């Protein structure tokens, strides 16, 4: 089948910048090409067809270009209601096939995360779980690296973790992380840790505790 | 106004079957190319089925031999059955019409997709409705503290979405972070949300988090009691 | 209050605040293979068009031709 591959996946811009995404066809597409604008909660918009034709109702700072396999779209001054997921599409054969989404967030500085850790409750424990969280407040930008070690030991394959939405106070993000064990997996080790690797801290934050200390 | 609106939306078994509908209006139907795009929960769109004007039925890879589209032209209605479904079928599935643009040398079909429904949620899941067990996320000795202390509360294993959580009836609102809930292997979603307070007020202030399962009769007023942990290892 | 629609199907009834009837005619970006778009219809007035869309605008029902 036809694959679309934007690029990036995520940009950063400010209210004034001008941003371009690039869609990438696997094969010629001629000029078969869309781009829909997504909002959370809410459906899809068509804002260009054929590679370059605005939709009606669409403002003029929107604009396309390409053919064949390369297209671009463009705004050309960002607006805070232009902060939303963007997709290109093909309609050149079937099946037809969307890129992978662009996420256009808010530009601000760096702001490294406060770093805490979290027990499980006693009451949790008597139902034969037990859940670590680690929860990092208040960073930018999204990329932040959370290793769970168990007894200095990388954990794979046994937590989960969940980003909030871009802050509207400070357009930073935080990050909840659960490390979820049996009730008799949990007493066998001594000491939880919750290591964050992010561009704001000098070096990686490590928050850690001793099952039996708490 | 033009308008296409989903019906059927629901809960349905692993290998079984569920009909999505489509009620349009405000344009002359028969005429157009339909088509079924769906959105998985934080991924992105996929075309699922397209039904053309003239009647050719057109299936995604995936769905091929277990999907079936099709139109009642003078019900204005595009309706599409789902069969053998799979967890990963799990989506919004919007209805969409497929342009119809005219030029001095016609008429052409499904170049674009103009007119989006505001979709309708489909679960596959072997899950039935769990109320959640709620946990505290107990503040600490400097582990949850840095000046500022965080507390929450772990909304774990219920079913299905969604949950509210306030923090003391909404009194407090500052500082409050309720994150997205995760599908864990079970089957059964699992959410937290915590605050950040001034870690002085630990001894005194009162935090309840106010934890609304709509879909079941549940409701949980958990208080966030101060834990300490030793250290006496260091 | 009723024009003539792109397609000769589709209900001539404009929505409620307008009486004015339009021709629009462009080119799009499939002008090369295609011709020109026409699109007919309703407006609250006559429609601020963009550079190369010849418009044509009247008020009488069932004008726009
Ligand atoms: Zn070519
Ligand atoms: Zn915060
Ligand atoms: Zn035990
Ligand atoms: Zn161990
Ligand atoms: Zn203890
Ligand atoms: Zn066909
Ligand atoms: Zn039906
Ligand atoms: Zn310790
Ligand atoms: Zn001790």
Known sequence: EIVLTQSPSSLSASVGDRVTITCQASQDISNYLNWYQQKPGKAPKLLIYAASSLESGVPSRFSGSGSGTDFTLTISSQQPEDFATYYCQQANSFPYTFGQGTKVEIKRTVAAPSVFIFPPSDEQLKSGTASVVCLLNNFYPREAKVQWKVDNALQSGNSQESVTEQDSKDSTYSLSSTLTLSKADYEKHKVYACEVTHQGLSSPVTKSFNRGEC | ?234 | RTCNKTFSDQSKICPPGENICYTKTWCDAFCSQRGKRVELGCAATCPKVKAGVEIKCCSTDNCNK
């Open chain 2, 1 to 234: 106004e033009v308008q296409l609106v989903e019906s059927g939306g629901g809960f349905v078994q692993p290998g079984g079957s569920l009909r999505l509908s489509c009620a349009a209006s405000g344009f002359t139907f028969s005429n157009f190319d339909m088509h079924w795009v769906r959105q998985s929960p934080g991924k992105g769109l996929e075309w699922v089925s397209g039904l053309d004007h003239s009647g050719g039925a057109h299936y995604a890879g995936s769905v091929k031999g277990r999907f079936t589209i099709s139109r009642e032209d003078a019900k204005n209605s595009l309706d599409l059955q789902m069969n053998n479904l799979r967890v990963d079928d799990t989506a919004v599935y919007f209805c969409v019409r497929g342009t119809l643009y005219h030029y001095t040398s016609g008429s052409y079909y499904s170049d674009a997709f103009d007119i989006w429904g505001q979709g309708t949620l489909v679960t596959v899941s072997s899950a039935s409705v769990k109320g959640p067990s709620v946990f505290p996320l107990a503040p600490s000795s400097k582990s949850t503290s840095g000046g500022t202390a965080a507390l929450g509360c772990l909304v774990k294993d219920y079913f299905p979405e969604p949950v509210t959580v306030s923090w003391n009836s909404g009194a407090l609102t500052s500082g409050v972070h309720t994150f997205p809930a995760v599908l864990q292997s079970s089957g059964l979603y699992s959410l937290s949300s915590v605050v950040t307070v001034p870690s002085s007020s630990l001894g005194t202030q009162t935090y309840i988090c106010n934890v609304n399962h709509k879909p079941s009769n549940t409701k949980v007023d958990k208080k966030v009691e101060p834990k300490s942990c030793d250290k006496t290892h260091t």
